[PDB]
């Protein structure tokens, strides 16, 4: 009678409604570490969202980032919860790090959700409340996602554009795989052409297209050449590819 008793006890004491009842105390921690383990269920994440929705305004930056990354990984959008998340980020924008704000903005970009105050506070936090070399440690895909977030929302901050443009490099684009570097370069050039902002570091982006032009389409090469001509006129010179020397 070990089999039936053990089997009956295990299902009753081990199924997914009671391990949602262990996760009511610390919803950011548990939702993050369960979504990173592949457990992404809408049925559990609705209970996560309404369990954490009064707790959001007092959450730290680590817990807000963990919650926001978890709810990207589940792909469950709650309007009220993410409005609370955005109010938490807007209230404590000086305490957030660029490493966390890129992950938050990627989730706020995944489904469309934005405020003028949220975009202003994220831009103020990345430009003035964080280190100016924090986009260098970021990875070019996250900076491209933040750039297209600000491009799709139409919100233009030239100081944030300079700060995030500093993160684009031969190093950061070289860390990316080629299929990822294609999307990163195309989205970053589209954002830079939308804003009309052409910094020096766009040479690292356009060059990352023109060093390997075989992966790009003819249409994408045409849009890259348009951005190259505009950046040539804005920076007052001619774009050269530099070999080893």
Partner 1 sequence: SSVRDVKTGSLPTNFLTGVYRFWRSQNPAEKPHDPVNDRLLPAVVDASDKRASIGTWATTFFCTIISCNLLGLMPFNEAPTSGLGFATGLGVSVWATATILGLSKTGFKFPFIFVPLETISYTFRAVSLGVRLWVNMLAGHTLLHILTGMALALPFSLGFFSMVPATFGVCCLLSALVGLEYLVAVLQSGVFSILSTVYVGEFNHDKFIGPAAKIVK
Choice from 115, 169, 180, 194 touching partner 1 (CB under 8 A): 169
The least distance separating partner 1 from the CB of residue 240, rounded to whole angstroms, comes to: 6
Q: How far apart are CA 111 and CA 72, in angstroms?
A: 9
Indicate whether 229 belongs to the interface with partner 1 (CB under 8 A). Answer: no
The least distance separating partner 1 from the CB of residue 239, rounded to whole angstroms, comes to: 5
The least distance separating partner 1 from the CB of residue 226, rounded to whole angstroms, comes to: 15
Choice from 106, 210, 221, 230 touching partner 1 (CB under 8 A): 210
Q: How far apart are CA 210 and CA 241, in angstroms?
A: 8
Q: Which is nearer to partner 1, 28 or 167 (CB)?
A: 167
Structure token pair of residue 193: 């052409």
Indicate whether 213 belongs to the interface with partner 1 (CB under 8 A). Answer: no
* Residue bearing tokens 């489904």: 111
Q: How far apart are CA 208 and CA 95, in angstroms?
A: 34
Q: How far apart are CA 192 and CA 76, in angstroms?
A: 30
Indicate whether 214 belongs to the interface with partner 1 (CB under 8 A). Answer: no
Q: Is 194 helix (H, G, I), strand (E, B) or coil?
A: helix
Per CB under 8 A, the segment of 21-29, 86-94, 119-127, 194-202 that binds partner 1 is: 194-202
Indicate whether 185 belongs to the interface with partner 1 (CB under 8 A). Answer: no
Here the contacts of 111-115 (C-beta below 8 Å, separation 24 or greater) are 111/75, 111/77, 112/152, 113/77, 113/79, 113/82, 113/86, 114/149, 114/153, 114/155, 115/86, 115/90
Choice from 166, 181, 182, 190 touching partner 1 (CB under 8 A): 166
Indicate whether 211 belongs to the interface with partner 1 (CB under 8 A). Answer: yes
Residue ranges binding partner 1 (CB under 8 A): 133, 136-137, 162, 165-167, 169-172, 174, 199-201, 203-204, 206-207, 210-211, 231-232, 235-242
């Amino acid at each position: 009678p070990s089999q039936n008793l053990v089997s009956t006890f295990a299902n009753k004491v081990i199924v997914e409604e009671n391990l949602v009842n262990v996760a009511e105390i610390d919803v950011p921690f548990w939702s993050y570490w369960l979504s990173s383990a592949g457990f992404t269920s809408k049925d559990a994440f609705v209970k996560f969202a309404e369990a954490v929705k009064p707790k959001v305004a007092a959450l730290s930056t680590s817990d807000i980032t963990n919650l926001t990354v978890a709810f990207k990984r589940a792909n469950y959008y709650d309007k009220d919860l993410f409005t609370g998340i955005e109010a938490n980020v807007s209230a404590n924008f000086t305490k957030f790090e660029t490493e966390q704000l890129l992950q938050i903005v990627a989730t706020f970009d995944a489904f469309n959700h934005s405020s003028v105050a949220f975009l202003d506070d994220v831009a103020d936090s990345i430009t003035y409340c964080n280190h100016y070399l924090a986009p260098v440690r970021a990875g070019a895909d996250e900076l491209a996602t933040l750039l297209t977030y600000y491009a799709k929302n139409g919100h233009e901050r030239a100081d944030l554009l300079a700060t995030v443009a500093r993160g684009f490099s031969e190093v950061s684009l070289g860390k990316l795989s080629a299929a990822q570097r294609k999307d990163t370069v195309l989205s970053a050039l589209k954002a830079f052409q939308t804003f009309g902002f052409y910094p020096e570091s766009i040479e690292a982006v356009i060059g990352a297209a023109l060093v390997s032009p075989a992966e790009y389409s003819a249409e994408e090469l045409k849009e890259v050449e348009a951005v190259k001509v505009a950046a040539e006129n804005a920076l007052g010179g001619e774009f050269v590819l530099i070999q080893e020397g």
